[PDB]
Write a protein that binds this ligand. Sequence first.
Ligand SMILES: OC[C@H]1O[C@H](Oc2ccc(-c3ccccc3)cc2)[C@@H](O)[C@@H](O)[C@@H]1O
Length: 158
Amino acid sequence: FACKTANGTAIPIGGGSANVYVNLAPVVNVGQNLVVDLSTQIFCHNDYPETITDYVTLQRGSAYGGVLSNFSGTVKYSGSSYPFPTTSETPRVVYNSRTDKPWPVALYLTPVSSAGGVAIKAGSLIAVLILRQTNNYNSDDFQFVWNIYANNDVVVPT
Ligand SMILES: OC[C@H]1O[C@H](Oc2ccc(-c3ccccc3)cc2)[C@@H](O)[C@@H](O)[C@@H]1O
């Protein structure tokens, strides 16, 4: 099992970490949702689908900076919703193909009532997503860290 970003930065067999830089809605109103969709940025595949089932959770979705102080957050994993920042590991998803498949992860962040001005600072770290990979074959328990970085400021109209 391995993953890669849309720009081609890879995290090989065994885990590791990568930086993902995402473009955001530049202007977001209170009562409106800012969508960070990593299913366009993060892909993974199973190296031996003939024999092995890879199982993939979001183990932890952690929040920093302006995403942590100005937004209320939900995280959609493979079709179900959860709090973001997360409260427990999600259910396991199966990668059974060598073709690279999206990691089905999307942040849905809503500005808090007191939000206003520059809610997210360009180039800050807005989130750390922990991908957890196991299988049905050995005792492999591997961690693919995604450090999510803002490509641009986000303003909440005042
Ligand atoms: O995606 C599946 C796995 O691929 C990696 O591990 C192995 C371990 C063993 C074999 C193998 C076994 C017998 C003959 C030829 C190859 C192939 C891959 C490893 O990434 C792991 O976590 C992941 O479950």
